[PDB]
Amino acid sequence: MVLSEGEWQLVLHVWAKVEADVAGHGQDIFIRLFKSHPETLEKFDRFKHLKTEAEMKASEDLKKHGVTVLTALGAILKKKGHHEAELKPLAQSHATKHKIPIKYLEFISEAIIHVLHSRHPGNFGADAQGAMNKALELFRKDIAAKYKELGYQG
């Protein structure tokens, strides 16, 4: 699949807003993910002890992790589809070291859309959400293909 320049513009326009507060968006997204799909929390040995949203918000390590994740995702989105090089190491660590099923990538994609919808309604209307979903589907599709080449079905 391929996004048009118009769709990329919608994606990058709302992403520019997210970059005004990467740490904050990172926390909201992971808290949403962990609360909505608690099973994903078990994949993080560093955070699986967190019991409440309050503890999650107060975790300095979780906040730093969120920044690392969103920074990596932002770099991929800014490539506008030409992300082969960026995807290689990400696909290897998540398939081989962390063992993250494609299903879980769908869950975090849902969390990202939910947070952008809540925080940026004016810049995240129907068309913008469709563009973001398409960009994330492309990401998940290419990651899945790499998973297979690497020997991980998940």
Ligand code: HEM
């Ligand atoms: C938007 C998709 C995602 C991106 C861009 C992303 C990115 C990253 C990055 C850059 C790191 C640090 C470097 C590395 O280990 O490769 C990381 C670590 C990790 N990711 Fe992801 N990730 C994504 C989704 C997920 C999901 C859905 C899970 C599982 C629910 C997951 C689990 C992990 C784990 C367990 C680590 C190691 C954390 C640690 O122990 O420090 N990731 N991820």
